[PDB]
Design a protein around this ligand. Sequence first.
Ligand code: SF4
Ligand code: SF4
Ligand code: FCO
Ligand code: FCO
Ligand code: SF3
Ligand code: SF3
Ligand code: F3S
Ligand code: F3S
Ligand SMILES: [Cl-]
Ligand SMILES: [Cl-]
Ligand SMILES: [Cl-]
Ligand SMILES: [Cl-]
Ligand SMILES: [Mg+2]
Ligand SMILES: [Mg+2]
Ligand code: NI
Ligand code: NI
Lengths: 581, 581, 263, 263
Amino acid sequence: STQYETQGYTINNAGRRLVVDPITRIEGHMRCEVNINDQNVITNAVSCGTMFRGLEIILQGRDPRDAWAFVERICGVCTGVHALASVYAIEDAIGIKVPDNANIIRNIMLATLWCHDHLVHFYQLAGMDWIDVLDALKADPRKTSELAQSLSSWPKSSPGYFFDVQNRLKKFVEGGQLGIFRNGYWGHPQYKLPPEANLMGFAHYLEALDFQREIVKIHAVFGGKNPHPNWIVGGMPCAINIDESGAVGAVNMERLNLVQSIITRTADFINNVMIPDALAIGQFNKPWSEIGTGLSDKCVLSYGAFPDIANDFGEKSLLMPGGAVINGDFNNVLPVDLVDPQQVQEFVDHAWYRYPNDQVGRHPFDGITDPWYNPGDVKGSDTNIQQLNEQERYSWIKAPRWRGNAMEVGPLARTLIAYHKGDAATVESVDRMMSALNLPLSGIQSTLGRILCRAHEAQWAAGKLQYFFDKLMTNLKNGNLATASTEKWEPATWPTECRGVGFTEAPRGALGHWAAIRDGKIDLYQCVVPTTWNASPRDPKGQIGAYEAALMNTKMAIPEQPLEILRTLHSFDPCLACSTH
Amino acid sequence: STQYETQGYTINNAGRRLVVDPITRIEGHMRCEVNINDQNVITNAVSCGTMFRGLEIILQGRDPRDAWAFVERICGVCTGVHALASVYAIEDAIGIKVPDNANIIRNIMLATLWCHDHLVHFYQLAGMDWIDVLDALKADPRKTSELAQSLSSWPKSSPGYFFDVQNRLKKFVEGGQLGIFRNGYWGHPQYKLPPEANLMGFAHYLEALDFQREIVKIHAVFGGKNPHPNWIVGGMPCAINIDESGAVGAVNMERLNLVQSIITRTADFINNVMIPDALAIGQFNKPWSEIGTGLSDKCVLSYGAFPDIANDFGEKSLLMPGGAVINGDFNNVLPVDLVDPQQVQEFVDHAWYRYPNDQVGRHPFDGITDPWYNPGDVKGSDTNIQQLNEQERYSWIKAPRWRGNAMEVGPLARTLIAYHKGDAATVESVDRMMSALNLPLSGIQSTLGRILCRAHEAQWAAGKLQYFFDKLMTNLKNGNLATASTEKWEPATWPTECRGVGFTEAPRGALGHWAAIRDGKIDLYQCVVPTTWNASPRDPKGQIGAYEAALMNTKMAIPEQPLEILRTLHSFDPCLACSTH
Amino acid sequence: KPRIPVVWIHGLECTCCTESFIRSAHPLAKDVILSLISLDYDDTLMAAAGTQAEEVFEDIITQYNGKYILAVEGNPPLGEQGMFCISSGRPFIEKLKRAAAGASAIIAWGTCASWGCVQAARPNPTQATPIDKVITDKPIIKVPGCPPIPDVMSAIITYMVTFDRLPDVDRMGRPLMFYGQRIHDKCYRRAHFDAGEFVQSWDDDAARKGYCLYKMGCKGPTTYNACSSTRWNDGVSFPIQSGHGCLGCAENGFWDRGSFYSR
Amino acid sequence: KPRIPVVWIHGLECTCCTESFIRSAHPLAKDVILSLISLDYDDTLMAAAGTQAEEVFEDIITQYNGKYILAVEGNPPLGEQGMFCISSGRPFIEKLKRAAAGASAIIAWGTCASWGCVQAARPNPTQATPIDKVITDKPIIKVPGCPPIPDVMSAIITYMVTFDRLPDVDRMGRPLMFYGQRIHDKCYRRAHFDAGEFVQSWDDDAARKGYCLYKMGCKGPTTYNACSSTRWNDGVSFPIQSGHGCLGCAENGFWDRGSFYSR
Ligand code: SF4
Ligand code: SF4
Ligand code: FCO
Ligand code: FCO
Ligand code: SF3
Ligand code: SF3
Ligand code: F3S
Ligand code: F3S
Ligand SMILES: [Cl-]
Ligand SMILES: [Cl-]
Ligand SMILES: [Cl-]
Ligand SMILES: [Cl-]
Ligand SMILES: [Mg+2]
Ligand SMILES: [Mg+2]
Ligand code: NI
Ligand code: NI
């Protein structure tokens, strides 16, 4: 066993080793290992991506116009965000400017995804870490109605409703076929909600499972389908026709009416179901404002997103701010440049890849994806990993750093950047939210905080959907219908050699696609995706990523039942297919 | 002035005349006149259909296969019921037997219509006679929540919801644009609900307006569209294919799944919203259990409906019983035969038509539709009527009688027939309903009763939807897919001369279409429709129809405000396009 | 801010267009009524009857003279001095003319108001006559169909309110947006038409595979509407999708073009 | 009354088919899980993780040996001794084979499980391999598409539960009910294809009238699925309806049949 210091942490692999494989209630394949000391406190944390597909290799030789369709399939959970980054990247390489309506519709696609993804994560993925579903069977339906009505104007709150939900659950469990509830952590002492709050939460889990299907109707209108909508280089393919013959063959007034009806219902559900539930989880789990801080009080990163001025990706255009904080200095939000080779770099000394020199980090325009499964001694065999060897290569996830710093990305990172750049809406929302919980600002830099920030982002995005829809309708009123630029659709119009970056803020954090085009085809396509940052393995200096840092120093009540580990990992909303691509 | 006695009434047209023209919150065109005495009690009532189109004349010379499509357009409110009667009639004439699945699907179409039509009538047509909408502005939202929750398990009951509904109404009226609420009867002393019940009812009005659009999705799956779905002689055109290539072109498992989803939601809304509201109206308006009895304690008529044994229209097959009661003898439910010339007859001595002898009635196989606008000695003129002359011709509606008796038809009529025939489910439902109100069985023979029975029937029909659906699925599991008989589709296969009767129970009562075919073409097509019975003018004996009887003896608080007249008329759910056709 | 006044009157009709309107999925008819328009007169839905309804009519057309939209469902009969359709003891046509005179624009909902529909089919006993043969001095927007599609009706309303203009129309006064193309020009069974793959009798193997309905009398090739694209009842179906040929119900005179089952 | 046990495993995948499943409109995914099946193992949704999830897996396949349906999303990679996809420290393929041995039948959801999908596109770095090339002694129902249509997924489940049988399949193991016909055989723009009425460049006048997308690379003529009939997301749209050609996403090898914008 060894011990070393990094980022204020003592990394110590003495003591009992615990393995959590598979991690569930995530997208894709992750393994986690920890060591715990004699006080059952984590002294070592190991994040491992247990899948790889190789989209950066598959994209070579494709037509740049087809790239979005391939890379969209990086992930069906964050569906669409890789398509958006792809068309941005190709447009940046070739020098294409899209019409305003295309930009607006792309912003609608992204806000729709934020709403949908954050909602499903809250209930279906993270929810059962905080809601003891079986304990709901003990709730009094009238007290449940009373609790719900105290927290929200939401209509669906009758005692009869909560009895009916409880009875449904009782009948489900009675025959022993507990399905997704089988062999859960129910009754663990870290479940702190009273029975009435567990029944309210469970009822909302079911309401959210139903309602989330509606949100993506917006993606069906503009993008044909969800999951995995369609896009084009040059704008969007959903041509508009309001008042001419053949409007039946296009986005028309009836299609836009459908979109508006979805936006309203989406805001109403998030504001009156998700938001109060998130605040309730906070009220009943305040000690988790002090657990899982990790890198969130040290180093956070946003590239920014939602350009409101079409084809302008600068600070005055992006509605979601970009910037970096390092060394815990939130008074100096630093500018991020994705072309600068000294900024974003990826290491593979602790990952299953080959570089000519594994001690140096490669900017994505110099990126290499040469898979090399080489786990070393893992106390088993190459096909039987009993214990990862975190002194050597232990993951299919590359290790991104920013100016050599290990960063956290995602909703909490974004909130902190916007807050400290002085975004007024963000300051007021954050201050009001922490005031309501009677917690200091620092309480946001936590596992609880990640959940709170995610819910507040769903609210933000639902508001922006309306703003963007109104912008589109203003252009239509003014007779501005254009949805595609095709001046540079034909490969004969492109530079022989060019490269470009497409970037955005996906639901999980900062996303970039770096593309080099030569002779009409993709020569290089490198992706660095938010869970790549957060779930990163170590680097040549031994620095730990966001997941490992957030797990460090965490008490476990019951070692064999990894609820604390799940709570903190799920708070980051891991998408492993994204991380590895 | 004159006075005469009929059916236990004193018909006296001395004294003040009141005119209500137009009747609103009905389908189509109706005029009502009454005389009231010094005591503000109605001593004479005059029912006038103020429209005519002449479908029976238009059908002459048409192909029998087309007839359903023309007669469907008798009415877009009871949409589909005339199509059903038509295919039944033509199939009866020609000798066509349809496959079981076609019969089951037709039963589904009819039950769907009962649910939809009853629900809309309750809220949108009759509701504002009972619910004081402006009084809902005075309610307390918490007391409204408490009331709703005391009556129902329905989820949507939070104080915040009722506050939101109230504020929507408050905003609606704040600009002085009261729309459908303008110049209403608000504040009239016969409005008896407390403010909280008014706000509860008004919230439900809005929920029903939204929800009714879903119910008719069942019509769209099997019949293409609603309003006015499609049908065929020989069955239905909605071919089924569950497990073969090209199921995407037919009623397949996904289409059936949509139907099931609508059936469950329909039952839920009726059982937990409409049913408790009907009972609540009963609880607050018990005196209306003794108002508007009319013919309902003397003569009631049902043809019966919903044949469960395909192509068998007998007593053992019809799920909704048929029968007639006269002379108030509910111990003698009499069989109805629609071919017997001495049973159903129509008189026109007081209607705008020509007969060779207007002192006798004509069975519909001998029917004549020869319009003659002759209002005679009106107050005013023939193009400017101040008062109809009820001693002569005063209506576009013919006067149907059964064995010379004036009958009431519709949900109360059916309920009485089924109750007195000993239908266990009907007896249980009625007994439970009247027990909850602490009212005698006789309390159903009333204006309030007509509303309670209509709600009852919506529940009944929602249960039958599931029963029929299950029957269909049972056939499909057994490989029984057939939906049309075509061996007699071509005209050369028909009898050179034949006639037939198609009958059913529409939402408003007993419907029949009598058709004669000769040489491939419709020779005669006569319709007697439920509102024709209820809104009937007088006959040569001076006998009054159901609406005129139910209005007799009614007290009015404020002669200039016809609230009591509207309550009673609306309780029958008048469809004037139906009545006149 | 005030909502646009709408006066909805009914001649000879079956009320299908009214029912279609309330089916609207987006915007919901509830929201159209509460938030988008002021539905100031409507026999189907209004609280007031009789003399109170007459007062509403008179007050609205007077106070908002020149400023309301007039929606007409149904048609006036010219037979029997108009008394085949009576309102307030007088021919309906007098109400139509009074309402029309104060309207900024007129929407003819459905085939009845647009062309005649079933009451005008041979032999037209009442001499039912479409609105534009009586009202000759005002813009009439024809929205035909029996009834028109619910979300078409609400889309036309939202267009007028959002864009503050009438929809552009074809030479017959039909909105281009929804009536510019034929049913058969956007029909998902066109593959089968083009291949000669036809239903020949109901519930044959062709019918069970969704083959073309042309030999069963489908009039989609001569009918302009949005049924094969927008579809019906929140996109759930349309006539052809559920196995019946188009009747031609959006086209002038469609009842008297021969049997629905003939070419 | 007991519900049919379902074990859902995930190989290399993007999880789009799981997301599609939960979009189901009728039956709602909620009702599928609570009332129609017993979803007894599923990495995406299950409470238990790690050793607890391993215990569920082992108990279910043992207790219900011969009696559960195995749903598979994604595929096994044969490269690096299978360790391009690791489950409880061992190759995913081992878990696949264990789960398959006890299943009464296998549903291969999506193009990944059916054929390979994007990870199998040239040059297939991981040697991703479809389930039927590894499991060779069990009934496998291929439900391809990237992802398949939500209401198609739920319709297949309901069929299996209601009818107590597997859907009948084509020669490739795809359910005839939803894969028997081509997209282009039920496409509402086929009129335009027949007339030579094509979009030539994005947002041209043809595109704004809903013309055929064949010259923009639409692969509808060779693709079998229900998208042009059943459509997507409760019938709201499908790729072609919103202006993009079909990519061919239900067909084996579709990523490597040339540019989506070429013929
Ligand atoms: S079904 Fe009718 S509209 Fe469709 S292709 Fe055939 S003929 Fe044309
Ligand atoms: S859009 Fe595609 S599927 Fe439709 S007709 Fe054209 S080529 Fe065929
Ligand atoms: N959000 C998201 Fe997926 C991840 N990580 C991307 O990009
Ligand atoms: N219900 C109904 Fe209409 C009437 N009256 C018919 O038939
Ligand atoms: Fe909507 S009233 Fe119905 S008949 Fe044909 S349009 Fe007329
Ligand atoms: Fe639903 S996992 Fe998504 S990539 Fe194409 S099917 Fe695979
Ligand atoms: S009958 Fe009418 S509803 Fe549409 S499909 Fe034909 S125009
Ligand atoms: S791309 Fe796929 S989703 Fe359908 S339309 Fe083509 S098979
Ligand atoms: Cl009117
Ligand atoms: Cl016509
Ligand atoms: Cl798995
Ligand atoms: Cl493939
Ligand atoms: Mg990468
Ligand atoms: Mg008649
Ligand atoms: Ni993802
Ligand atoms: Ni009617």
